Symmetry: C2
Subunit: 112 residues, 2 copies
């Protein structure tokens, strides 16, 4: 990856749209953190429905502007009735449930 963004600096790109899994998104952004291309001048776009699912605090205050798509908006009260149940769910009985938010893949499974 350090070879990769250096090869992106052969073109000196500032505009990278990622297409990765939520883990693989977070792994490469941590490599962007390692090289510091989260600073101002860069722009990134996360191409999934889980833009809120990723970790945004790691690169909120770096300088690059991060965009994305969210199909599961938590501001809806119908979603908020789920979240108020979701965080109160037992993690031991319902694994991955005792959280503040939810993956959109888990939300669409509940939607199905």
């Amino acid at each position: 990856y350090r070879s990769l963004f250096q090869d992106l600096e052969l073109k000196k790109e500032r505009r990278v749209i990622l297409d990765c899994e939520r883990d693989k998104v977070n792994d490469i952004v941590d490599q962007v953190i390692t090289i510091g291309k989260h600073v101002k001048g860069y722009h990134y776009i996360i191409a999934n429905l889980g833009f809120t699912d990723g970790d945004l605090l790691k690169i909120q205050f770096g300088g690059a502007e991060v965009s994305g798509f969210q199909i599961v908006d938590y501001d809806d009260s119908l979603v908020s009735k789920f979240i108020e149940r979701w965080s109160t769910l037992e993690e031991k009985e319902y694994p991955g449930a005792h959280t503040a938010t939810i993956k959109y893949t888990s939300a669409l499974t509940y939607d199905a």
Copy 2:
């Protein structure tokens, strides 16, 4: 600390010599990581005998 380095950007400093404990060195550098002032153009000097003790 985000207020602090912004106040260092009131002078736009690139040259910061730290004088902190090994934990407090690593805590502030992680805030430099958070704002990205570990990029080229900056220079830092760690003022202790444990330069290899920290996380490089």
